[PDB]
Structure 1
Amino acid sequence: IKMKSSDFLESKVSLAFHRTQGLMIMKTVYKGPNCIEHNEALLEEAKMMNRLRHSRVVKLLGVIIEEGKYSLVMEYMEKGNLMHVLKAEMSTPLSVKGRIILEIIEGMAYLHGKGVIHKDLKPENILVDNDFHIKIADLGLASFKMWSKLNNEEGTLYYMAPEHLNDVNAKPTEKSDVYSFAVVLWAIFANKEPYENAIAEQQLIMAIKSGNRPDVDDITEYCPREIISLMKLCWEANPEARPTFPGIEEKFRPFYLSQLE
């Protein structure tokens, strides 16, 4: 699982070419003074990332732990993130959008089943391959404590549950990821980011905390009536009222097979 920087041809998210295994994605996280006290915990977190093995989760291919330099190596996803694909000038049919929603659900159920709270689910953390299959990613390292710590030693809020806005000590839960899935759902059918009419961040933060949600009327594409009810269910103000991902998969999978696929 551990690699060396010299395992890569010579040229912060970059395309990298490993000398034997080929094209990969490299994110160098820290390039400063030595800090080897963190190293066993960083290595154990990398091993936890590497044990996340599921078709809808980006695989960690390697970790570089060098005396001044820490890097994570991931597999490459050819088509970029969900928002870029939704905005490409070829249209994405309802059947493919339905499949993507189910795969996001499958990936998120798997992560929650492994005791992982994503904490930063958004269209940019949903990557797409050539066949329009998706994998969940963590570009800002929001999910693993020590790597997030190392990233910050010396982000968009459209998808943040309202309980976390203006609250640095609220602990993210499974219901915080369910909130983010709701707005991603809205984005998949609007083909754009929400809240285009916001003027100021404090206006948007306070509006969302008081009950503002993405404009369902701004979906001019056909959006099945059950998916509008799903997003509204998932962005409920009270987290206890939000469903779980296994619960979402149990209602959305038959609906996807009978109507959308």
Structure 2
Amino acid sequence: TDMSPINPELVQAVQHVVIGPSSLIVHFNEVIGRGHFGCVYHGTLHCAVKSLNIGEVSQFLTEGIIMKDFSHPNVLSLLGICLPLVVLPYMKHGDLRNFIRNETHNPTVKDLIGFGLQVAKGMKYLASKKFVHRDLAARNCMLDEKFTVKVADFGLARDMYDKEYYSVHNKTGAKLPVKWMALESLQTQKFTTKSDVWSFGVLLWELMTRGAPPYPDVNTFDITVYLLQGRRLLQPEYCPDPLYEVMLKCWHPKAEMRPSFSELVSRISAIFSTFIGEHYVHVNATYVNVK
């Protein structure tokens, strides 16, 4: 790549994931959200129920067991499955991007770095389980009633929850979040933990801009050409210098040189500790109403 610029066994194993049909009520009237692979609904077990569409039933059950094993306060857990329903905890404040964009919320610099810090702790956990997210972005993290950020949009909850930010590769037909993708993944369509780190860098930029779209009007795989002119996202007005240095390390041309999620947790927690909640972050006028 260019990096310099120019089945009885399965049935008993899945028993701890299955929810009984009579112990779950799905409210099909109240559409929480929509996705390509399944619509999400209000449920009572209080929860969110995503309803999906023989060979593929193995895959559904097996994905449930792997996903049920993930337990961490900054990771969206799986409450269970039902049969094609995916039962998830209800997140009161919805997705992180919409939350920070909302003009009636008044986040401080400390608040937003805090969300970033929480996301890093979630990825640190997922990365320790050898799990590559492939689509880390503020739209795909969620926020509960205590403002705990949970990395979401993985396993059976995987979808395109805002079609706007996914672009079709002309050959393969795969719709990909090109504005969040590492320089190497744009060229190969292979994803690693180090390509998640790049995405996390972009997520930090989203946090400090209160959910501005990255790279306005650079929307296709021609982002690769843009990056290879020698470019990175600009430092946001309310982003501290040390945090922007962290963002630039996340976008290191050589994947191996990017920091681990352990190192990111360490560095961000230090930066975070210096703030006391006196810097209100306001939205840039040039990013308002921009997609």
TM-score category (smaller protein): 0.7 to 0.9
Which of 59, 78, 84 pairs up with 1:60?
Answer: 78
5+ residue gaps, structure 2, are 1-16, 29-37, 160-172, 278-291
The sequence identity of aligned pairs, in percent, is 26
The 1:61–1:209 alpha-carbon spacing in structure 2 relative to 1, beyond 3 Å, is farther
Structure with the bigger RCO (C-alpha within 8 Å, sep 6+) is 2
Alignment-derived partner of residue 212 in structure 1? 231
Residue in structure 1 matched with residue 61 of structure 2 by the alignment: 43
Which sections of structure 1, spanning at least 5 residues, go unmatched?
Answer: 31-35, 143-151
From 68, 75, 87, the counterpart of 2:101: 87
Shift of 1:9: 4.0
Find the partner of 2:86 among 66, 72, 83: 72
* 3-state SS of paired residue (2:52): strand
Which amino acid is the alignment partner of residue 95 of structure 1?
K
Which of 213, 220, 223 aligns to 1:201? It is 220
1:50–1:228 distance in 2 versus 1, CA, 3 Å: same
Match of 1:13 among 39, 42, 58: 39
Name the amino acid aligned to 1:129. D
- 1:111 corresponds in structure 2 to 126
Aligned length, in residue pairs: 232
RMSD: 2.3
Matches of 1:41 and 1:164, distance apart in 2: 26
In the TM superposition, 1:145-164 aligns within 5 A as 155-164=176-185
Contact 2:43 2:49 in 1 (8 A): no
Secondary structure of 2:133's counterpart equals: coil
Q: Is residue 141 of structure 2 the alignment partner of residue 141 of structure 1? A: no
Distance in 1 between residues matched to 2:232 and 2:99, nearest whole Å: 23
Paired residue type of 1:239: A
Q: Which residue of structure 1 aligns with residue 49 of structure 2? A: 26
Determine the C-alpha separation between the residues in 1 that align with 2:90 and 2:215.
31
Asked whether the equivalents of residues 176 and 239 of structure 1 are also in contact (C-alpha less than 8 Å), the reply is yes
Aligned-residue offset at 1:99: 1.2
How far off is 1:10 after superposition?
Answer: 5.1
2:88 is matched by which residue type in structure 1?
Answer: M
Tell me the CA shift for residue 3 of structure 1.
3.1
Amino acid at match of 2:78: L
Q: Secondary structure at the match of 2:188?
A: coil
Contact 1:195 1:215 in 2 (8 A): no
Structure with a larger share of its residues in helix: 1
Structure 2-normalised TM-score?
A: 0.73
CA contact (8 A) 1:105 1:249 kept: yes
Q: Compared with structure 1, are the counterparts of its residues 10 and 254 closer, same or farther at alpha carbon in structure 2 (3 Å cutoff)?
A: closer
Q: TM-score, normalised by structure 1?
A: 0.80
**Greater mean deviation of Cα atoms: 80-89 or 3-12:** 3-12
Q: 1:229 aligns with which of 229, 232, 245?
A: 245
1:178 matched to 2:197: yes
Q: Which runs of 4+ in 1 moved over 6 A?
A: none
- Residue 17 of structure 1, CA deviation: 2.0
C-alpha contact (below 8 Å) 2:95/2:143 kept by paired residues: yes
**Counterpart residue number, 1:189:** 208
2:115 to 91, 100, 103: 100
